[PDB]
Design an enzyme around this catalytic site. Structure first.
Site, PDB file in Angstrom:
ATOM      1  N   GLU A  20      40.897  46.147  43.792  1.00 48.10           N
ATOM      2  CA  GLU A  20      40.104  45.600  42.696  1.00 48.10           C
ATOM      3  C   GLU A  20      38.866  46.464  42.432  1.00 48.10           C
ATOM      4  O   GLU A  20      37.742  46.047  42.653  1.00 48.10           O
ATOM      5  CB  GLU A  20      39.691  44.165  42.962  1.00 48.10           C
ATOM      6  CG  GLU A  20      40.823  43.192  43.061  1.00 48.10           C
ATOM      7  CD  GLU A  20      40.373  41.741  43.094  1.00 48.10           C
ATOM      8  OE1 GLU A  20      39.250  41.518  43.610  1.00 48.10           O
ATOM      9  OE2 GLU A  20      41.093  40.869  42.539  1.00 48.10           O
ATOM     10  N   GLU A  40      47.874  39.676  42.054  1.00 49.51           N
ATOM     11  CA  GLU A  40      47.420  38.420  42.672  1.00 49.51           C
ATOM     12  C   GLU A  40      47.209  37.421  41.535  1.00 49.51           C
ATOM     13  O   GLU A  40      46.613  37.742  40.511  1.00 49.51           O
ATOM     14  CB  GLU A  40      46.100  38.556  43.385  1.00 49.51           C
ATOM     15  CG  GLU A  40      46.084  39.601  44.511  1.00 49.51           C
ATOM     16  CD  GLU A  40      44.763  39.756  45.176  1.00 49.51           C
ATOM     17  OE1 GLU A  40      43.880  38.879  44.963  1.00 49.51           O
ATOM     18  OE2 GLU A  40      44.551  40.728  45.916  1.00 49.51           O
TER      19      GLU A  40
END
Ligand SMILES: OC[C@H]1O[C@@H](O[C@H]2[C@@H](OC[C@H]3O[C@@H](O[C@H]4[C@H](O)[C@@H](O)[C@@H](O)O[C@@H]4CO)[C@H](O)[C@@H](O)[C@@H]3O[C@@H]3O[C@H](CO[C@H]4OC[C@@H](O)[C@H](O)[C@H]4O)[C@@H](O[C@@H]4O[C@H](CO[C@H]5OC[C@@H](O)[C@H](O)[C@H]5O)[C@@H](O)[C@H](O)[C@H]4O)[C@H](O)[C@H]3O)OC[C@@H](O)[C@@H]2O)[C@H](O)[C@@H](O)[C@H]1O
Ligand SMILES: OC[C@H]1O[C@@H](O)[C@H](O)[C@@H](O)[C@@H]1O[C@@H]1O[C@H](CO[C@H]2OC[C@@H](O)[C@H](O)[C@H]2O)[C@@H](O[C@@H]2O[C@H](CO[C@H]3OC[C@@H](O)[C@H](O)[C@H]3O)[C@@H](O)[C@H](O)[C@H]2O)[C@H](O)[C@H]1O
Length: 386
Positions: A155, A293
Site C-alpha cells: 500500500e 484486500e
C-alpha cells in the site's frame, strides 16, 4: 499462460493475513499476530471453501541481515507455505508487504513522523534495495510456473497523516519503484520472464490510481502484468475507521437497513461505480486488476443479527459479482481472529485455521453467490477453447 489466461481461473481470492507479514525477526513471526501455524490442511480448507487464489502478505526486509540477505530459514519456510498452495493448484500472489515501512513509508518520506519529501538519493537507494530483495525472491522461486505471481509492494504511501494530499506528487516515484521491481524479476529469466507480476497503485486507492497511474505509465505493455488496488469502503462497515460503537455500520445494502447503525454511503451503486473505474483504466486495456484486500466485519450485535448477517453476505456477494463482471479478482482479508466474530467489534475472518473449517459462513456464502452471479469478461487476441 499469460495474465489473461490465469486471471479467468483465479477468482475468488483469499489472504493469509496477519501471518508471514508480521514484523518479527524470526520464523516465529508467523504466529505472532495470529495463533495458527500454517499447514497443508489449512490451505486445503481454503481450497475446499471455493477460493482459487491465495495472497500471501510477506515481509522480507525485516527478515534480512545487515547485508540485505534474506534469512535462509525464513526463505525456506515461505517456500513451504507457497508449496502448500501450489500442491493444490492454487494461484499465489506473493508480495513484499508493509514490512515495517521500509519502502511503503520511507520510500516516500524521509521521516515516519511528518512528511519530508524524499530526494533522488533516497529514491535510487530504495530502488537498489527493492531490486536486491526481489532478485533474491525471484531466484529462489524461479522454477515455479504461472501459478505463482509476485506483487512488488503493498500500500505505497497509504499512511494518511503523512501522505494525504500528496498523491499526484508521489505517484511518479511509485512508478519508478514498480518499474524497478519488474526489471529485477524479469532479469532473472526462466519462468520469471513469463510470470505474471502485480504492481500497486498509489495508496492502493482507486480514485488516485485511475487519475495518476494511467495504463501508459505502467512498466510493461499488457500481457503479463496486473494492477493492484485495495477496497475498504465504507470504512465503518469494513473495519478501517470509526468501525465500532455509535459510528459503526452494521447494515449494508438497501434491502438490509435496520433500526440504527445503517451505512449512509458506500453501498452497491458506489461499489459498482468504483469498480467500473478500474475497468475503464485497466481491465479494458488488458491489465487484469486484483482487489488485493477487501473485507466486511462480521459481528455479534444486540440488534437485528439476521439483518447484519445478511449485510455481510450481501457485501461479499457484491464485491465478488461486480469484480468478476469487471475483470477483477478480489481477495478477502482474513487474519484468523475467530474471537472477534463473537463481539460487536467484529472480525473479517472466514477460515477458522485451527479447525481447518469455515466459520464466517455469511461472508463465505456471499463470496460463492457473487462468483456464481458474475460473468468474467474475456479480452483475447486469438481463439481460445472455452
Ligand atoms: O506491531 C505492529 C506495528 O504495526 C504498525 O501498523 C502497520 C501494520 O499494521 C498491522 C495491522 O495490519 C492490519 O491489516 C492491514 C493490512 O496489513 C494492510 O495491508 C492494510 O490493508 O491495512 C490493514 C489495517 O491496518 C491487520 O488487520 C491488523 O490486525 C494488524 O494489526 C496488528 O495486529 C496484531 C494482532 O492483533 C489483532 O488481531 C488479533 C486480535 O485479537 C487483536 O484484537 C487485533 O489487534 C497485533 O499483535 C498483537 O499485539 C498485542 C499487543 O498490541 C496491542 O496492545 C497495544 C496496542 O498498542 C497495539 O496497537 C495492540 O495491537 C499482543 O498482545 C498480541 O500477542 C499480538 O498478537 C499487532 O499489535 C497489530 O499491529 O501494518 C499495516 C500498516 O498499514 C500499519 O501502519 C504500527 O504503526 C506500529 O506502531 C506497530 O504496532
Ligand atoms: O440465544 C441468545 C443467547 O442466549 C443465552 O441464554 C446463551 O447463553 C447464549 O449462548 C446465547 O447466545 C448465542 O450464543 C451462541 C453460542 O451458544 C453456545 O455457546 C454459548 C452457550 O451459552 C450456548 O448454550 C451454546 O449453544 C452464539 O452462536 C455462535 O455464534 C458464532 C458467531 O456467529 C456469527 O459469526 C459467524 C457467522 O457465520 C454467524 O452467522 C454469525 O451470527 C458462530 O461461529 C458459532 O458457530 C455459534 O455457535 C450466538 O451468536 C449467540 O447469540
Amino acid at each position: 499462460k499469460d495474465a489473461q489466461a490465469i486471471a479467468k481461473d483465479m477468482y475468488p481470492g483469499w489472504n493469509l493475513g496477519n501471518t508471514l507479514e508480521a514484523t518479527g525477526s524470526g520464523l516465529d513471526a508467523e504466529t505472532s499476530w495470529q495463533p495458527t501455524l500454517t499447514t497443508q490442511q489449512i490451505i486445503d480448507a481454503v481450497k475446499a471453501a471455493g477460493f482459487k487464489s491465495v495472497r500471501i502478505p510477506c515481509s522480507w526486509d525485516i527478515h534480512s541481515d545487515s547485508n540485505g540477505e534474506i534469512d535462509a530459514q525464513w526463505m525456506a519456510r515461505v517456500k513451504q507455505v507457497v508449496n502448500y498452495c501450489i500442491n493444490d493448484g492454487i494461484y499465489v500472489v506473493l508480495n513484499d508487504h508493509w514490512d515495517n515501512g521500509w519502502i511503503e513509508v520511507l520510500g516516500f518520506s524521509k521521516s515516519s513522523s511528518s512528511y519530508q519529501a524524499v530526494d533522488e538519493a533516497t529514491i535510487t537507494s530504495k530502488i537498489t534495495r527493492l531490486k536486491d530483495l526481489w532478485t533474491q525472491i525471484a531466484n529462489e522461486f524461479k522454477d515455479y510456473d504461472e501459478h505463482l505471481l509476485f506483487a512488488g509492494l503493498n500500500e505505497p504511501f497509504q499512511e494518511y497523516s503523512l501522505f494525504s494530499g500528496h498523491h499526484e506528487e508521489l505517484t511518479p516515484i511509485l512508478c519508478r519503484y514498480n518499474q524497478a521491481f519488474v526489471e529485477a524479476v524479469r532479469a532473472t529469466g526462466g519462468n520469471n520472464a513469463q510470470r505474471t507480476l502485480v504492481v500497486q497503485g498509489p495508496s492502493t486507492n482507486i480514485n488516485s490510481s485511475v487519475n495518476y497511474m494511467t495504463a501508459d505509465k505502467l512498466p510493461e505493455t499488457a500481457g503479463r502484468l496486473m494492477v493492484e488496488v485495495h477496497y475498504y469502503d465504507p470504512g465503518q462497515f469494513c473495519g478501517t475507521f470509526d468501525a465500532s460503537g455509535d459510528n459503526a455500520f452494521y447494515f449494508w445494502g438497501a434491502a438490509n437497513h435496520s433500526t440504527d447503525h445503517n451505512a449512509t454511503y458506500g453501498e452497491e451503486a458506489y461499489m459498482l461505480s468504483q469498480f467500473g473505474l478500474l475497468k475503464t483504466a485497466y481491465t479494458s486495456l488488458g491489465y487484469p486488476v486484483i482487489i488485493g484486500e477487501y473485507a466486511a466485519l462480521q459481528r455479534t450485535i444486540s440488534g437485528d443479527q439476521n439483518k447484519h448477517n445478511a449485510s455481510v453476505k450481501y457485501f461479499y456477494q457484491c464485491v465478488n459479482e461486480y469484480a468478476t463482471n469487471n475483470g477483477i479478482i478480489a481477495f478477502a482479508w482474513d487474519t484468523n481472529d475467530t474471537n472477534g466474530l463473537n463481539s460487536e467489534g467484529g472480525s473479517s475472518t472466514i477460515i477458522d485455521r485451527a479447525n481447518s473449517a469455515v466459520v464466517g459462513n455469511n461472508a463465505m456464502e456471499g463470496v460463492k453467490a457473487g462468483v456464481a452471479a458474475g460473468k468474467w469478461p474475456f479480452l483475447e487476441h486469438h481463439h481460445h477453447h472455452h
